[PDB]
């Protein structure tokens, strides 16, 4: 493709290397993507609202294009979240009078949605984020209070996994979440999946989002989350990895490029992280970055609107950053 080696090829015997994509990137960054990633995830085009905007109408155009792109190139595809409190259209939770949908309506609608979406790509998607972010960040709260929990019921996770498993018994079913390394939330997610497994739910993996930064979480904290989750006998996927140069509610907004400090910390940070991933390659089977290159990232608008970020190992011009070289795998 040019000079630099293929990132995914360097991990061909350890774990997949993926990237979140959007159709707009294909006929422009398609060459770069096929070069460095052997796994892709629709950043947004497979979400409920994106593929099922209205009750009786599905819009799979974008998702279909991404899948054609990947499968024709031997690139794997992770399906992103079927059940999530965000990006799910209002119709799903409402009845004809605009009131709340009943438990029965919720169940039949969820069944048809999963059957349509999961069934559509049957045998083509190696892993599905079945339930996303069900655990609360608040210390004294376990289950996030969402319409799924209120309208469908406390068994909404079991239901989702059973339905997904039925739509495609060959796909690996994942429970995906962020802040997965925080000791308190870690134990909640651990107990959740454990209880799901004890209930017979077909959950085959835990997705560690990996929305980290140059200051944390620590190697020790990440290590503990890994061993903790792996002890449930499930595969582990780092699903939305990015290393923000900013912290939580950062007050800095004048940066037009990372500071010399940020660049140096990020490079070392990425080296440490992938060093840890290699150590646990027996538990981690896929590592996906939530983007392709610094020219685009959802962090450019979250949590702060219009604040440019540079979270990847590839810069705004798709050129490798120092971190890239320190991340190359051993194969």
mmCIF file of C-alpha atoms in Angstrom:
data_model
loop_
_atom_site.group_PDB
_atom_site.id
_atom_site.type_symbol
_atom_site.label_atom_id
_atom_site.label_comp_id
_atom_site.label_asym_id
_atom_site.label_seq_id
_atom_site.Cartn_x
_atom_site.Cartn_y
_atom_site.Cartn_z
ATOM 1 C CA UNK A 1 0.000 0.000 0.000
ATOM 2 C CA UNK A 2 3.053 2.208 0.548
ATOM 3 C CA UNK A 3 5.598 2.138 3.376
ATOM 4 C CA UNK A 4 4.295 1.351 6.842
ATOM 5 C CA UNK A 5 3.341 -2.271 7.623
ATOM 6 C CA UNK A 6 -0.251 -3.447 8.054
ATOM 7 C CA UNK A 7 -1.458 -3.044 11.641
ATOM 8 C CA UNK A 8 -3.896 -5.973 11.436
ATOM 9 C CA UNK A 9 -1.348 -8.250 9.753
ATOM 10 C CA UNK A 10 0.968 -7.626 12.709
ATOM 11 C CA UNK A 11 -1.652 -9.179 14.997
ATOM 12 C CA UNK A 12 -2.860 -11.945 12.660
ATOM 13 C CA UNK A 13 -2.042 -14.605 15.255
ATOM 14 C CA UNK A 14 -3.221 -12.674 18.312
ATOM 15 C CA UNK A 15 -6.483 -10.818 17.723
ATOM 16 C CA UNK A 16 -8.381 -8.872 15.083
ATOM 17 C CA UNK A 17 -7.706 -5.171 14.604
ATOM 18 C CA UNK A 18 -10.821 -3.236 13.705
ATOM 19 C CA UNK A 19 -12.150 0.245 13.131
ATOM 20 C CA UNK A 20 -15.530 1.952 13.382
ATOM 21 C CA UNK A 21 -16.600 3.116 9.925
ATOM 22 C CA UNK A 22 -19.275 5.053 8.039
ATOM 23 C CA UNK A 23 -20.180 4.545 4.356
ATOM 24 C CA UNK A 24 -18.864 8.027 3.575
ATOM 25 C CA UNK A 25 -15.333 6.779 4.315
ATOM 26 C CA UNK A 26 -15.384 3.762 2.009
ATOM 27 C CA UNK A 27 -14.919 5.300 -1.448
ATOM 28 C CA UNK A 28 -12.112 7.474 -0.095
ATOM 29 C CA UNK A 29 -10.393 5.707 2.809
ATOM 30 C CA UNK A 30 -11.356 2.227 1.664
ATOM 31 C CA UNK A 31 -7.805 1.396 0.590
ATOM 32 C CA UNK A 32 -6.350 2.505 3.936
ATOM 33 C CA UNK A 33 -9.034 0.639 5.882
ATOM 34 C CA UNK A 34 -8.609 -2.665 4.034
ATOM 35 C CA UNK A 35 -4.870 -2.323 4.600
ATOM 36 C CA UNK A 36 -4.839 -1.837 8.372
ATOM 37 C CA UNK A 37 -8.017 -3.501 9.633
ATOM 38 C CA UNK A 38 -9.359 -7.041 9.361
ATOM 39 C CA UNK A 39 -12.485 -6.097 11.335
ATOM 40 C CA UNK A 40 -14.965 -3.211 11.118
ATOM 41 C CA UNK A 41 -17.975 -1.943 13.038
ATOM 42 C CA UNK A 42 -20.675 0.400 11.772
ATOM 43 C CA UNK A 43 -20.097 3.444 13.965
ATOM 44 C CA UNK A 44 -23.789 4.350 13.656
ATOM 45 C CA UNK A 45 -25.382 2.795 10.579
ATOM 46 C CA UNK A 46 -26.472 -0.436 12.260
ATOM 47 C CA UNK A 47 -28.128 1.185 15.263
ATOM 48 C CA UNK A 48 -31.868 0.821 15.792
ATOM 49 C CA UNK A 49 -32.828 4.292 14.530
ATOM 50 C CA UNK A 50 -30.519 3.952 11.537
ATOM 51 C CA UNK A 51 -31.900 0.629 10.258
ATOM 52 C CA UNK A 52 -35.462 0.746 11.627
ATOM 53 C CA UNK A 53 -36.620 4.434 11.604
ATOM 54 C CA UNK A 54 -40.307 3.548 11.426
ATOM 55 C CA UNK A 55 -42.176 0.487 12.694
ATOM 56 C CA UNK A 56 -42.918 -1.107 9.319
ATOM 57 C CA UNK A 57 -39.892 0.164 7.418
ATOM 58 C CA UNK A 58 -36.243 -0.920 7.441
ATOM 59 C CA UNK A 59 -33.441 1.082 5.818
ATOM 60 C CA UNK A 60 -30.426 -1.220 5.447
ATOM 61 C CA UNK A 61 -28.692 0.587 2.555
ATOM 62 C CA UNK A 62 -25.712 1.944 4.491
ATOM 63 C CA UNK A 63 -25.243 -1.204 6.592
ATOM 64 C CA UNK A 64 -25.467 -3.377 3.497
ATOM 65 C CA UNK A 65 -22.702 -1.369 1.822
ATOM 66 C CA UNK A 66 -20.410 -1.727 4.824
ATOM 67 C CA UNK A 67 -21.002 -5.481 4.938
ATOM 68 C CA UNK A 68 -20.389 -5.903 1.183
ATOM 69 C CA UNK A 69 -17.171 -3.922 1.619
ATOM 70 C CA UNK A 70 -15.896 -6.095 4.450
ATOM 71 C CA UNK A 71 -16.988 -9.595 3.421
ATOM 72 C CA UNK A 72 -15.631 -9.196 -0.114
ATOM 73 C CA UNK A 73 -12.248 -8.363 1.414
ATOM 74 C CA UNK A 74 -12.139 -11.031 4.103
ATOM 75 C CA UNK A 75 -12.786 -8.371 6.734
ATOM 76 C CA UNK A 76 -14.888 -9.366 9.737
ATOM 77 C CA UNK A 77 -17.874 -7.385 11.002
ATOM 78 C CA UNK A 78 -19.094 -6.723 14.543
ATOM 79 C CA UNK A 79 -22.781 -5.815 14.792
ATOM 80 C CA UNK A 80 -23.263 -2.793 17.018
ATOM 81 C CA UNK A 81 -25.915 -2.816 19.709
ATOM 82 C CA UNK A 82 -29.451 -4.076 19.218
ATOM 83 C CA UNK A 83 -30.701 -2.897 22.617
ATOM 84 C CA UNK A 84 -29.493 0.475 23.886
ATOM 85 C CA UNK A 85 -31.213 3.446 25.569
ATOM 86 C CA UNK A 86 -29.727 5.830 23.004
ATOM 87 C CA UNK A 87 -30.364 6.083 19.268
ATOM 88 C CA UNK A 88 -33.576 4.068 19.515
ATOM 89 C CA UNK A 89 -36.610 5.729 17.832
ATOM 90 C CA UNK A 90 -39.622 6.857 19.861
ATOM 91 C CA UNK A 91 -42.085 4.644 17.966
ATOM 92 C CA UNK A 92 -40.464 1.591 19.536
ATOM 93 C CA UNK A 93 -41.541 2.660 23.037
ATOM 94 C CA UNK A 94 -44.963 4.098 22.182
ATOM 95 C CA UNK A 95 -48.500 2.886 21.505
ATOM 96 C CA UNK A 96 -50.961 4.405 19.017
ATOM 97 C CA UNK A 97 -52.028 7.216 21.376
ATOM 98 C CA UNK A 98 -48.439 8.282 22.002
ATOM 99 C CA UNK A 99 -48.479 6.582 25.381
ATOM 100 C CA UNK A 100 -46.036 3.892 26.504
ATOM 101 C CA UNK A 101 -45.967 0.555 24.722
ATOM 102 C CA UNK A 102 -47.040 -2.443 26.806
ATOM 103 C CA UNK A 103 -44.718 -5.305 27.771
ATOM 104 C CA UNK A 104 -46.263 -7.501 25.063
ATOM 105 C CA UNK A 105 -45.751 -4.865 22.355
ATOM 106 C CA UNK A 106 -42.156 -4.344 23.519
ATOM 107 C CA UNK A 107 -41.478 -8.085 23.343
ATOM 108 C CA UNK A 108 -42.984 -8.674 19.893
ATOM 109 C CA UNK A 109 -41.328 -5.536 18.486
ATOM 110 C CA UNK A 110 -37.931 -6.502 19.923
ATOM 111 C CA UNK A 111 -38.323 -10.014 18.488
ATOM 112 C CA UNK A 112 -39.106 -8.752 14.987
ATOM 113 C CA UNK A 113 -36.323 -6.181 15.104
ATOM 114 C CA UNK A 114 -33.693 -8.714 16.178
ATOM 115 C CA UNK A 115 -35.001 -11.340 13.745
ATOM 116 C CA UNK A 116 -34.832 -8.834 10.894
ATOM 117 C CA UNK A 117 -31.457 -7.291 11.761
ATOM 118 C CA UNK A 118 -29.557 -10.291 13.143
ATOM 119 C CA UNK A 119 -31.143 -12.690 10.660
ATOM 120 C CA UNK A 120 -30.261 -10.438 7.721
ATOM 121 C CA UNK A 121 -26.528 -10.930 8.269
ATOM 122 C CA UNK A 122 -26.787 -14.475 9.611
ATOM 123 C CA UNK A 123 -23.388 -16.203 9.385
ATOM 124 C CA UNK A 124 -21.743 -12.956 8.282
ATOM 125 C CA UNK A 125 -21.289 -11.122 11.593
ATOM 126 C CA UNK A 126 -18.899 -12.820 14.002
ATOM 127 C CA UNK A 127 -20.002 -10.794 17.030
ATOM 128 C CA UNK A 128 -23.046 -8.758 18.104
ATOM 129 C CA UNK A 129 -23.250 -6.144 20.845
ATOM 130 C CA UNK A 130 -26.648 -7.424 21.996
ATOM 131 C CA UNK A 131 -27.139 -5.146 24.995
ATOM 132 C CA UNK A 132 -25.257 -1.877 25.416
ATOM 133 C CA UNK A 133 -24.621 0.163 28.573
ATOM 134 C CA UNK A 134 -27.225 -1.351 30.918
ATOM 135 C CA UNK A 135 -25.189 -0.612 34.066
ATOM 136 C CA UNK A 136 -25.292 2.752 35.891
ATOM 137 C CA UNK A 137 -22.262 4.969 36.560
ATOM 138 C CA UNK A 138 -23.771 6.166 39.854
ATOM 139 C CA UNK A 139 -22.090 4.353 42.768
ATOM 140 C CA UNK A 140 -25.300 3.251 44.505
ATOM 141 C CA UNK A 141 -27.177 2.279 41.338
ATOM 142 C CA UNK A 142 -26.928 -0.981 39.416
ATOM 143 C CA UNK A 143 -29.337 -1.138 36.484
ATOM 144 C CA UNK A 144 -29.477 2.009 34.354
ATOM 145 C CA UNK A 145 -33.066 3.301 34.377
ATOM 146 C CA UNK A 146 -34.133 2.956 30.742
ATOM 147 C CA UNK A 147 -37.352 2.474 28.797
ATOM 148 C CA UNK A 148 -36.271 -1.093 28.044
ATOM 149 C CA UNK A 149 -36.156 -1.837 31.767
ATOM 150 C CA UNK A 150 -39.427 -0.015 32.480
ATOM 151 C CA UNK A 151 -41.619 -0.986 29.528
ATOM 152 C CA UNK A 152 -40.293 -4.439 28.709
ATOM 153 C CA UNK A 153 -39.081 -5.539 32.132
ATOM 154 C CA UNK A 154 -36.120 -6.641 34.241
ATOM 155 C CA UNK A 155 -35.684 -9.675 31.990
ATOM 156 C CA UNK A 156 -34.985 -7.526 28.930
ATOM 157 C CA UNK A 157 -31.336 -8.617 28.755
ATOM 158 C CA UNK A 158 -32.143 -12.354 28.921
ATOM 159 C CA UNK A 159 -34.813 -11.830 26.274
ATOM 160 C CA UNK A 160 -32.472 -9.926 23.953
ATOM 161 C CA UNK A 161 -29.740 -12.576 24.160
ATOM 162 C CA UNK A 162 -32.169 -15.468 23.618
ATOM 163 C CA UNK A 163 -33.670 -13.727 20.592
ATOM 164 C CA UNK A 164 -30.285 -12.831 19.127
ATOM 165 C CA UNK A 165 -28.982 -16.361 19.670
ATOM 166 C CA UNK A 166 -32.039 -17.722 17.860
ATOM 167 C CA UNK A 167 -31.686 -15.345 14.902
ATOM 168 C CA UNK A 168 -28.103 -16.561 14.406
ATOM 169 C CA UNK A 169 -26.804 -19.353 16.699
ATOM 170 C CA UNK A 170 -23.305 -18.940 15.246
ATOM 171 C CA UNK A 171 -22.751 -15.298 16.198
ATOM 172 C CA UNK A 172 -20.869 -14.485 19.415
ATOM 173 C CA UNK A 173 -23.206 -12.517 21.689
ATOM 174 C CA UNK A 174 -21.656 -9.648 23.660
ATOM 175 C CA UNK A 175 -22.594 -7.382 26.541
ATOM 176 C CA UNK A 176 -20.895 -4.037 25.763
ATOM 177 C CA UNK A 177 -20.196 -1.168 28.196
ATOM 178 C CA UNK A 178 -17.891 1.785 29.019
ATOM 179 C CA UNK A 179 -15.952 2.713 32.195
ATOM 180 C CA UNK A 180 -15.574 -1.060 32.312
ATOM 181 C CA UNK A 181 -12.328 -0.847 34.302
ATOM 182 C CA UNK A 182 -13.645 1.304 37.158
ATOM 183 C CA UNK A 183 -13.540 -1.046 40.202
ATOM 184 C CA UNK A 184 -17.124 -0.295 41.198
ATOM 185 C CA UNK A 185 -18.707 -0.528 37.741
ATOM 186 C CA UNK A 186 -16.467 -3.480 36.887
ATOM 187 C CA UNK A 187 -18.006 -5.599 39.654
ATOM 188 C CA UNK A 188 -21.506 -4.567 38.575
ATOM 189 C CA UNK A 189 -20.892 -5.600 34.958
ATOM 190 C CA UNK A 190 -19.200 -8.760 36.228
ATOM 191 C CA UNK A 191 -22.199 -9.667 38.405
ATOM 192 C CA UNK A 192 -24.603 -8.815 35.576
ATOM 193 C CA UNK A 193 -23.002 -11.168 33.060
ATOM 194 C CA UNK A 194 -22.513 -13.782 35.773
ATOM 195 C CA UNK A 195 -26.231 -13.642 36.609
ATOM 196 C CA UNK A 196 -27.056 -13.836 32.901
ATOM 197 C CA UNK A 197 -24.897 -16.921 32.483
ATOM 198 C CA UNK A 198 -26.450 -18.470 35.597
ATOM 199 C CA UNK A 199 -29.887 -17.815 34.063
ATOM 200 C CA UNK A 200 -28.931 -19.669 30.895
ATOM 201 C CA UNK A 201 -28.707 -16.569 28.694
ATOM 202 C CA UNK A 202 -26.364 -17.134 25.732
ATOM 203 C CA UNK A 203 -23.766 -14.421 26.397
ATOM 204 C CA UNK A 204 -20.426 -15.394 24.873
ATOM 205 C CA UNK A 205 -18.439 -12.236 25.468
ATOM 206 C CA UNK A 206 -17.847 -8.940 27.184
ATOM 207 C CA UNK A 207 -17.110 -5.803 25.241
ATOM 208 C CA UNK A 208 -14.736 -3.397 26.942
ATOM 209 C CA UNK A 209 -15.409 -0.132 25.109
ATOM 210 C CA UNK A 210 -12.003 1.305 25.933
ATOM 211 C CA UNK A 211 -12.940 4.977 25.852
ATOM 212 C CA UNK A 212 -9.801 5.797 27.786
ATOM 213 C CA UNK A 213 -7.328 8.680 27.775
ATOM 214 C CA UNK A 214 -3.658 9.532 28.187
ATOM 215 C CA UNK A 215 -3.978 9.662 31.991
ATOM 216 C CA UNK A 216 -6.044 6.590 32.813
ATOM 217 C CA UNK A 217 -7.104 3.945 33.455
ATOM 218 C CA UNK A 218 -3.846 2.470 34.758
ATOM 219 C CA UNK A 219 -2.202 -0.732 33.576
ATOM 220 C CA UNK A 220 -3.152 -2.332 36.908
ATOM 221 C CA UNK A 221 -6.780 -1.277 36.629
ATOM 222 C CA UNK A 222 -7.018 -2.531 33.046
ATOM 223 C CA UNK A 223 -5.246 -5.769 34.013
ATOM 224 C CA UNK A 224 -7.738 -6.435 36.821
ATOM 225 C CA UNK A 225 -10.764 -5.769 34.612
ATOM 226 C CA UNK A 226 -9.385 -8.199 32.041
ATOM 227 C CA UNK A 227 -8.720 -11.092 34.432
ATOM 228 C CA UNK A 228 -11.986 -10.394 36.234
ATOM 229 C CA UNK A 229 -14.102 -10.586 33.074
ATOM 230 C CA UNK A 230 -12.115 -13.453 31.549
ATOM 231 C CA UNK A 231 -12.799 -15.507 34.680
ATOM 232 C CA UNK A 232 -16.418 -15.730 33.498
ATOM 233 C CA UNK A 233 -15.140 -17.916 30.663
ATOM 234 C CA UNK A 234 -16.210 -15.459 27.962
ATOM 235 C CA UNK A 235 -14.200 -13.926 25.138
ATOM 236 C CA UNK A 236 -13.128 -10.306 25.559
ATOM 237 C CA UNK A 237 -13.317 -7.645 22.868
ATOM 238 C CA UNK A 238 -11.970 -4.105 23.174
ATOM 239 C CA UNK A 239 -14.746 -2.565 21.114
ATOM 240 C CA UNK A 240 -14.448 1.242 20.897
ATOM 241 C CA UNK A 241 -10.862 2.074 21.781
ATOM 242 C CA UNK A 242 -9.656 5.679 21.677
ATOM 243 C CA UNK A 243 -7.161 7.647 23.750
ATOM 244 C CA UNK A 244 -8.497 11.149 24.283
ATOM 245 C CA UNK A 245 -5.854 13.772 25.059
ATOM 246 C CA UNK A 246 -8.410 15.357 27.399
ATOM 247 C CA UNK A 247 -9.921 14.317 30.744
ATOM 248 C CA UNK A 248 -13.513 14.290 32.016
ATOM 249 C CA UNK A 249 -15.134 17.718 31.663
ATOM 250 C CA UNK A 250 -11.891 19.256 30.465
ATOM 251 C CA UNK A 251 -11.868 23.074 30.502
ATOM 252 C CA UNK A 252 -9.285 23.338 27.691
ATOM 253 C CA UNK A 253 -10.640 24.524 24.330
ATOM 254 C CA UNK A 254 -7.952 26.517 22.502
ATOM 255 C CA UNK A 255 -5.881 23.565 21.244
ATOM 256 C CA UNK A 256 -5.638 23.220 17.474
ATOM 257 C CA UNK A 257 -3.209 20.302 17.825
ATOM 258 C CA UNK A 258 -2.059 18.207 20.776
ATOM 259 C CA UNK A 259 0.513 19.766 23.106
ATOM 260 C CA UNK A 260 4.028 18.312 23.123
ATOM 261 C CA UNK A 261 3.035 16.846 26.491
ATOM 262 C CA UNK A 262 -0.107 15.208 25.099
ATOM 263 C CA UNK A 263 1.732 13.726 22.123
ATOM 264 C CA UNK A 264 4.454 12.242 24.308
ATOM 265 C CA UNK A 265 1.999 10.801 26.824
ATOM 266 C CA UNK A 266 -0.268 9.314 24.168
ATOM 267 C CA UNK A 267 2.575 7.524 22.386
ATOM 268 C CA UNK A 268 3.788 5.928 25.631
ATOM 269 C CA UNK A 269 0.205 5.240 26.637
ATOM 270 C CA UNK A 270 -0.600 3.330 23.425
ATOM 271 C CA UNK A 271 2.650 1.367 23.742
ATOM 272 C CA UNK A 272 1.706 0.303 27.286
ATOM 273 C CA UNK A 273 -1.860 -0.676 26.384
ATOM 274 C CA UNK A 274 -1.050 -2.873 23.398
ATOM 275 C CA UNK A 275 1.784 -4.413 25.386
ATOM 276 C CA UNK A 276 -0.858 -5.472 27.893
ATOM 277 C CA UNK A 277 -3.210 -6.691 25.165
ATOM 278 C CA UNK A 278 -0.504 -8.970 23.751
ATOM 279 C CA UNK A 279 0.094 -10.381 27.232
ATOM 280 C CA UNK A 280 -3.595 -11.340 27.387
ATOM 281 C CA UNK A 281 -4.115 -12.273 23.732
ATOM 282 C CA UNK A 282 -5.493 -15.599 24.942
ATOM 283 C CA UNK A 283 -8.487 -13.748 26.433
ATOM 284 C CA UNK A 284 -8.769 -10.831 23.980
ATOM 285 C CA UNK A 285 -9.766 -11.902 20.454
ATOM 286 C CA UNK A 286 -10.547 -8.564 18.808
ATOM 287 C CA UNK A 287 -9.473 -4.969 19.367
ATOM 288 C CA UNK A 288 -11.399 -2.233 17.573
ATOM 289 C CA UNK A 289 -10.560 1.485 17.454
ATOM 290 C CA UNK A 290 -13.595 3.778 17.439
ATOM 291 C CA UNK A 291 -12.453 5.449 14.242
ATOM 292 C CA UNK A 292 -9.885 5.277 11.455
ATOM 293 C CA UNK A 293 -7.678 8.373 11.713
ATOM 294 C CA UNK A 294 -7.473 11.703 13.560
ATOM 295 C CA UNK A 295 -9.226 13.454 10.670
ATOM 296 C CA UNK A 296 -12.477 12.174 12.178
ATOM 297 C CA UNK A 297 -13.654 11.092 15.609
ATOM 298 C CA UNK A 298 -16.877 11.313 17.587
ATOM 299 C CA UNK A 299 -14.769 12.882 20.331
ATOM 300 C CA UNK A 300 -14.572 16.039 18.194
ATOM 301 C CA UNK A 301 -18.110 16.708 19.428
ATOM 302 C CA UNK A 302 -18.396 14.792 22.691
ATOM 303 C CA UNK A 303 -18.431 15.642 25.458
ATOM 304 C CA UNK A 304 -17.635 19.149 24.171
ATOM 305 C CA UNK A 305 -19.216 20.438 20.982
ATOM 306 C CA UNK A 306 -16.573 21.491 18.455
ATOM 307 C CA UNK A 307 -13.423 20.502 20.355
ATOM 308 C CA UNK A 308 -10.956 18.695 18.081
ATOM 309 C CA UNK A 309 -9.333 15.552 19.512
ATOM 310 C CA UNK A 310 -6.493 13.307 18.204
ATOM 311 C CA UNK A 311 -7.120 9.834 19.750
ATOM 312 C CA UNK A 312 -5.630 7.427 17.174
ATOM 313 C CA UNK A 313 -2.256 6.121 15.994
ATOM 314 C CA UNK A 314 -2.859 7.680 12.543
ATOM 315 C CA UNK A 315 -2.938 11.478 12.090
ATOM 316 C CA UNK A 316 -5.300 13.842 10.254
ATOM 317 C CA UNK A 317 -3.617 12.980 6.947
ATOM 318 C CA UNK A 318 -3.724 9.221 7.569
ATOM 319 C CA UNK A 319 0.016 9.162 8.234
ATOM 320 C CA UNK A 320 1.302 6.987 11.095
ATOM 321 C CA UNK A 321 2.052 8.749 14.376
ATOM 322 C CA UNK A 322 4.909 7.683 16.653
ATOM 323 C CA UNK A 323 2.378 5.560 18.525
ATOM 324 C CA UNK A 324 1.767 3.456 15.410
ATOM 325 C CA UNK A 325 5.335 2.146 15.391
ATOM 326 C CA UNK A 326 5.199 1.371 19.109
ATOM 327 C CA UNK A 327 1.952 -0.542 18.567
ATOM 328 C CA UNK A 328 3.013 -2.877 15.727
ATOM 329 C CA UNK A 329 2.287 -6.458 16.740
ATOM 330 C CA UNK A 330 4.491 -9.535 16.948
ATOM 331 C CA UNK A 331 2.130 -11.540 14.713
#
